[PDB]
């Protein structure tokens, strides 16, 4: 389960996602947390506003640069416990996978 969902009730989350989407219609509100029992690095930022025209692969690149992962290591990103295709658009992914509160929940692991 997500920590963000445990920290804030549905009302707060829905209000926030609606406000975000109304203020930045070109951006996608993403919550990105580390797999609980994984090994690799975890950072401070989990709240992202990533451009809708970005692909999944480009986003993966972005977070690799953010966490400063070593170029030899893998990083597997899960959405609803499945691995999304790298060539897929973030807008498509969002329309298909957005949560009831209007956020897109993303998990990542070093091993999978």
């Amino acid at each position: 389960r997500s920590q963000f969902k445990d920290d804030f009730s549905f009302e707060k989350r829905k209000t926030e996602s609606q406000r975000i989407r109304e203020k930045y219609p070109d951006r996608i509100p993403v919550i990105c947390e580390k797999v609980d029992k994984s090994d690799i690095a975890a950072i401070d930022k989990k709240k992202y506003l990533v451009p809708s025209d970005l692909t999944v692969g480009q986003f993966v690149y972005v977070i690799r640069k953010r966490i400063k992962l070593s170029p030899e290591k893998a990083i597997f990103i899960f959405i609803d416990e499945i691995l999304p295709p790298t060539a897929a658009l973030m807008s498509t992914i969002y329309e298909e996978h957005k949560s009831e509160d209007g956020f897109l929940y993303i998990t990542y692991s070093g091993e999978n």
Binding site: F8, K12, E16, R19, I20, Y24, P29, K45, K47, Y48, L49, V50, P51, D53, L54, T55, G57, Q58, F59, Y61, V62, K65, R66, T86, A87
Partner: peptide, 22 residues
Amino acid sequence: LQFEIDDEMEPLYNQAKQMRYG
């Protein structure tokens, strides 16, 4: 609840937009 545009991220986004893969 602290959801704002990060200036520490925008350059990365603009960098990634040019970085196409397969």
